[PDB]
Design a protein around this nucleic acid. Structure first.
Ligand SMILES: [Mg+2]
Ligand SMILES: [Mg+2]
Ligand SMILES: [Mg+2]
Ligand SMILES: [Mg+2]
Ligand SMILES: [Mg+2]
Ligand SMILES: [Mg+2]
Ligand SMILES: [Mg+2]
Ligand SMILES: [Mg+2]
Ligand SMILES: [Mg+2]
Ligand SMILES: [Mg+2]
Ligand SMILES: [Mg+2]
Ligand SMILES: [Mg+2]
Ligand SMILES: [Mg+2]
Lengths: 50, 245, 226, 118
RNA sequence: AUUACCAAUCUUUGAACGCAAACGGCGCAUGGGAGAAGCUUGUCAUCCCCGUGCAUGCCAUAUUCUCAGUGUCGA
RNA sequence: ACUUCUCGCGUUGUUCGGGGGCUCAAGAUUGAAAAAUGCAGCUCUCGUACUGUUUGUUGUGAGUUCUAUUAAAGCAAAAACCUGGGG
RNA sequence: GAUGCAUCCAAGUGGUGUAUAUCGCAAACUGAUUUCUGCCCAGUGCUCUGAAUGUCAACGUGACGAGAUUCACCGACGCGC
RNA sequence: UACACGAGUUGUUCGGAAACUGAGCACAACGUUAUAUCGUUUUGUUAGGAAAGUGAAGGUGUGGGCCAUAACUGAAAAGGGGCAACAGAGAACCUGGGUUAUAUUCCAAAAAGAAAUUGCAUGUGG
RNA sequence: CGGGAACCCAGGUGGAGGCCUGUAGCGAUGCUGACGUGCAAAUCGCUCGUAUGAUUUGGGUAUCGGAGCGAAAGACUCA
């Protein structure tokens, strides 16, 4: 709630950044296979627990 | 089947003496040079109550013979011993009620508690509350005293063992009836974890040799052999005389 | 003036009285004592006993006198000795480099053993103690097999200082120069009077069984009760 | 006979030669620069990071995470020749350590954001 | 400049080895480098960084680097 | 001291009974903090000013108070810290 | 009665009751007071005892065969009683 | 509380650690094990040699000692370390107020103030 | 304490108790209530048991698979 180690804090911060959409300069690339991010977590759906 | 409660107890996991509110092990002062070739005086300062014992433990301080400190000794308290009694525990010690003069030097027919079997083990025998030994015979040619343990079984010990003079405190504990399961709860919560005792005949025939049946009966004779394996050695172990006398 | 402290029993804190005898010594310290007492207790066989009846200090220093002056060359007079075997040979015309050890005592172990088997060791000196005691146990017994005068002497560390090593199991003193046939010819006599003349009683001599001063003065205080 | 006044044998205090101070376990060069440019990495421009330059005299730099409030002050003075009194820090929910920096009330903060180009 | 290949840089860890550990924590040496109050324009006070070293076991070894032993002996 | 007495709501204290003192921890008090704060109304027109800057009673409560009662239950330990004896 | 008893562990100067010491520990049974708790030790169990009671274990002893082996015997604690 | 973008968590003193011990854990050693990742292990370890905290002579600027830092020794001193409590112990801060969202955390010089407190320092008191 | 040569008649005081009513807490008797494609892979309602205690509860900590733990139902050991 208020106690999280800094290491456990560094690992949720690395997840708050991974939870951004694919930028719309990626899907005009020549031959990419990416249309969606397909690794977006939602805090309710699935939990990280770390 | 499964292991039986008695067998499942020398693992000592949960069924292990508690001893957190206990004081140290209560025992005589270490048998050094001073308690062999003289005495040393010691003042009784505090008589506490180790949780889980009916006998009072008296905190006796002596002086450390070699360093300059005051070493502090925890001893079981003979009845009558009060705070500030100046206890003597040596060779030439007097024989007042509480002193620890050696066992072969105490007069015969006397009354001694907290006697010790081996010369130095710091007090083993006659050490629960109200318990004591009577000195019967000295054998100065052998150098061994025959004292009568507080069970009738009278043995012979060496005449150089040490022994307090008196009766252990808290005598008459076992005569006040408990009157309720709750006063047995608080007795064993300072002692180890064996309460309540479920009867093995009220158990299932996987957890105990007696359990089973449509009726609560011991199927085979309760008296089990001395040689019987553990997990079977349940009931009346090597019972040589059986039942009401 | 005075202050008097009685460090009697229970009456005052003593000074730093030396204990050094009731203290807990480190393992090897006690264990090397319990070792030299255990082999005094037991019934030492008449073959191992031989090494606890060494020469006396009377002629032992004399025996170490010979071994010392006939000690080998110390890696410096060895390398400059065989150097004059080239310096005065490279200037020599040819076919003349002949050199050897000047004169010394056979100080190894397998070199000594051959000095005995060859019966060329005039007499051999043997050390009181070597760790695998069996390594020299048989030495004083192939001597009276080949009739060499042998000498069990008090310390291998004193057969090293004479020679030059740290320790030496056995020194053999073979042929010597006439500067010193007097001092050893008696040494042979002073020593076989202790080892060869005694050959019969030596091989029938069970040692040990030496009780304590604590547990055998007790056996004195009871014949006092007789 | 050595005097032992103890029940135990404690190890004798023998000689204790010091280590040799091995040369180094590296070759890689260092400077005065990298020690002060790794800490203060870039300032911050937000509605709150701007409101604190003008109103207060603070600045906002996203300092590196394993820095130190005493070394953000040194770094300021080494980079922006201004004094720093209070350096409040916080490791944001991005793993990035922000830093608020009072400028001693003698170096106007609004004269550094205009110098530093914030 | 890109690509390809073949001397470096190589964070925090991990055998992980200064100690610890849900601590991005704590030391002991050892340099050097900031920062400053005093103080003599600079000089090292705690404070604070950077780097090395510091785990246990084992082997070797030390110009005669120190020691222990009622082990052995001798002066 | 002829049994007196001091007790508390209460299971008790003396073998101490009054007059002054020495402290002790609660706790009040004046004073600083401290009114330029703050709540706020205002006369007027974030400016602008000033006029009021109030304590008493009850009751319940949390701690203080008194290291009774269940005890074959007697109701943790340690650092740091503190004082003293020797110094 | 501690070189104990109950018991754990693969084993160990290991562990549990036991910081305990027969007013204790372990193990059963019955189930508060009150009231009594009868008879049966053949059995199967525990238990001692073992002089002699009857018999056995390798080991040890002997003789046999050249030797593998045979034939014994010590009947020993135990096990019967 | 969805999606997107942007922001947002401020400490000498609050909590934690640095720095206590509890139930307990078990690195080392030691033992055992074909084998260990097993067991013992603070009511104090280990067949068991388990450590700079101090005091010192000597070294050093300089008119051979006034005075001073320092080295490197080494004074007694038994009982190896080490974890384990965000409710036990311990713990130096309190109001007032000017964020879209933080505040016993922020406020700058008529610190909005007022304290306590640790470290090192200069100096008035003996 | 009152009041009368034994120790009874009463008056208070005090506040004990695995005592009683009862809130929370913890349980789950009855309705064999309602749900039974649930709200719910065991819940809901009312009733009800207990509620200073052999109590409830938090965190830590011990003991687990031919085993643990059990006031013993072969209960419980992540449905
Ligand atoms: Mg069965
Ligand atoms: Mg059966
Ligand atoms: Mg040894
Ligand atoms: Mg070098
Ligand atoms: Mg490690
Ligand atoms: Mg080498
Ligand atoms: Mg030396
Ligand atoms: Mg010696
Ligand atoms: Mg204390
Ligand atoms: Mg969203
Ligand atoms: Mg291990
Ligand atoms: Mg209810
Ligand atoms: Mg928690």
């Amino acid at each position: 709630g208020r106690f999280k180690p800094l290491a456990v804090k560094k690992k949720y911060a690395k997840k708050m950044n991974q939870n951004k959409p694919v930028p719309y300069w990626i899907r005009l690339r020549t031959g990419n296979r990416i249309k969606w991010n397909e690794k977006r977590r939602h805090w309710r759906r699935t939990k990280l627990n770390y | 089947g499964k292991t039986v409660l008695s067998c499942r107890k020398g693992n000592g996991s949960v069924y292990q003496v508690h001893g957190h509110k206990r004081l140290g092990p209560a025992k005589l002062r270490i048998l050094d040079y001073a308690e062999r070739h003289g005495y040393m005086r010691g003042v009784v300062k505090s008589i506490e109550h180790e949780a889980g014992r009916g006998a009072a433990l008296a905190r006796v301080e002596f002086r450390h013979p070699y360093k300059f400190r005051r070493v502090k000794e925890l001893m079981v308290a003979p009845e009558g011993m009060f705070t500030g009694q100046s206890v003597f525990c040596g060779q030439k010690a007097p024989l007042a009620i509480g002193n620890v003069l050696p066992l072969g030097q105490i007069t015969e027919g006397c009354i001694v508690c907290n006697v010790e079997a081996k010369p130095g083990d710091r007090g083993t025998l006659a050490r629960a509350s109200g318990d004591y030994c009577i000195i019967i015979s000295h054998n100065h040619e052998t150098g061994r005293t025959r004292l009568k343990l507080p069970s009738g079984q009278k043995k012979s010990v060496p005449s150089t063992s040490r022994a307090m003079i008196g009766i252990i405190s808290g005598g008459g504990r076992i005569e006040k009836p408990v009157l309720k399961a709750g006063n047995s709860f608080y007795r064993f919560r300072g002692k180890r974890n064996c309460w309540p005792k479920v009867r093995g005949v009220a158990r299932n025939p996987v957890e105990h040799p007696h359990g089973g049946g449509n009726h609560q009966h011991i199927g085979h004779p309760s008296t089990v052999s001395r040689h019987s394996p553990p997990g079977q050695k349940v009931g009346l172990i090597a019972a040589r005389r059986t039942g009401r006398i | 003036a005075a202050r008097p402290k009685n460090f009697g029993i229970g009456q005052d804190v003593p000074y730093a009285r030396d204990l050094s005898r009731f203290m807990r010594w480190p393992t090897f310290v006690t264990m090397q004592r319990k070792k030299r007492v255990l082999q005094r207790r037991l019934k030492v066989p008449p073959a191992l006993n031989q090494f606890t009846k060494v020469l006396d200090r009377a002629s032992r220093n004399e025996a170490l006198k010979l071994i010392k002056k006939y000690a080998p060359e110390t890696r410096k007079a060895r390398r400059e000795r065989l150097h004059k075997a080239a310096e005065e040979k490279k200037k020599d015309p040819k076919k003349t480099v002949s050199t050897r050890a000047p004169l010394a005592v056979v100080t190894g172990l397998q070199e000594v053993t051959r000095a005995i088997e060859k019966k060329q060791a005039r007499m051999v000196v043997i050390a009181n103690n070597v760790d695998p005691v069996e390594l020299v146990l048989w030495m004083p017994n192939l001597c009276r097999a080949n009739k060499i005068p042998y000498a069990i002497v008090k310390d291998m560390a004193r057969l090293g200082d004479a020679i030059g090593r740290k320790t030496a199991t056995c020194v053999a003193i073979t042929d010597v120069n006439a500067e010193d046939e007097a001092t050893l010819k008696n040494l042979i006599r002073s020593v076989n009077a202790r080892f060869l003349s005694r050959s019969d009683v030596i091989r029938r001599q069970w040692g040990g069984l030496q009780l304590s001063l604590r547990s055998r003065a007790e056996l004195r205080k009871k014949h006092a009760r007789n | 006979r050595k005097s032992y006044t103890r029940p135990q044998f404690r190890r004798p205090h023998t000689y204790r030669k010091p280590a040799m101070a091995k040369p180094s376990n590296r070759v890689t060069v260092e400077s005065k620069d990298i020690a002060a440019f790794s800490v203060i990495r870039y300032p911050l421009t937000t509605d709150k990071a701007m409101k604190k330059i003008e109103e207060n005299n603070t600045l906002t730099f996203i300092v590196d995470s394993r820095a130190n409030k005493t070394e953000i002050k040194k770094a300021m003075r080494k980079l922006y020749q201004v004094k720093a009194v209070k350096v409040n820090t916080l490791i944001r929910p991005d793993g990035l350590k922000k830093a608020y920096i009072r400028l001693s009330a003698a170096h106007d903060a609004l004269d550094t954001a205009n110098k530093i180009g914030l």
